[PDB]
With several copies, the nearest count.
Chain A
Amino acid sequence: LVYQF
């Protein structure tokens, strides 16, 4: 879903 980069 939400990807942290």
Chain B
Amino acid sequence: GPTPASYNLAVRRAAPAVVNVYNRGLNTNSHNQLEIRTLGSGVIMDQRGYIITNKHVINDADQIIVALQDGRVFEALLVGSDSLTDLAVLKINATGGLPTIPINARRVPHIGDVVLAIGNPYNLGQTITQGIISATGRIGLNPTGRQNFLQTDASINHGNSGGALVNSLGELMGINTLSFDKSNDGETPEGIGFAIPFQLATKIMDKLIRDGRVIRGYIGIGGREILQGIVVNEVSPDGPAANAGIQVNDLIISVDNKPAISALETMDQVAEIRPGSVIPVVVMRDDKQLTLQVTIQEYPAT
């Protein structure tokens, strides 16, 4: 007869590649027994054993365990992690083949697309929740970051971090990262969750495998939006910015001969500038225009 409305197809395509991640730590105050400190999920990306998860899932782990839905359990090597995207890459050494998440480089995330969140909430076991893409390009709950979140109302709980957000074809849309739970009038928020889009996720992963960390250019300032531009609100004391003489209240209009149109696109711009470069930034103090040379440094670590 007729068939029930179902997203089972997407589950069967994508869910085998979403793993349970366990962060175990040594009980140093006892006798170094390994105890769970936190848990989450991960996504197997290719057949070489590379897995994307969140950094906060695996931070300071003495043992990272990766458990597949088909029963296989692995000790994982931390390939690297990036604190500003809250992404981290794990490697497992599986010789018999792996389930990999479906990826469509051509698919554009559209607001209103049906998405399925696949994770291990509260260690209940793999769980599928359904919603839509609620928004794109969100900064989440802290106002400064390069996370460029997809927003979704598929139910995300503790344990979903690092798992897959997937459309109805099984295609990876994002890595579920964070759920909203603070409020002004003390209400508890509902159906507001964020996931790093897969395009940026794969980009961070390839950098993590290549270099072991995410190398970014960095000037050493703190700016703000709107004579449109960026205003220096503070400068790090040994920032390249500082050594180059940029000061506070200075209106930045150009950075490496690209208009300082918005802090987010300028923040992306400087990050890809290889450290050690010398770029011009056009500045303004008291309506008088200056062009100063800044020697790009690498963004400090965490």
Contacts and interface: CB of A to CB of B under 8 A. Distances in A.
Interface of A: 1-5
Interface residues of B, number: 20
B270 interface: yes
Nearest to A4: B222
Contact of A2 (B218, B233, B270): B233
A4 B230 CA distance: 11
Contact of A1 (B218, B219, B224, B236): B224
A4 B144 CA distance: 8
7 contacts: A1-B143, A3-B230, A4-B221, A5-B219, A5-B223, A5-B267, A5-B270
Contacts of A4: 144, 221-222, 236
Contacts of B278: none
B211 interface: no
Contacts of A1: 143-144, 224-225
Nearest to B217: A5
Nearest to B255: A5
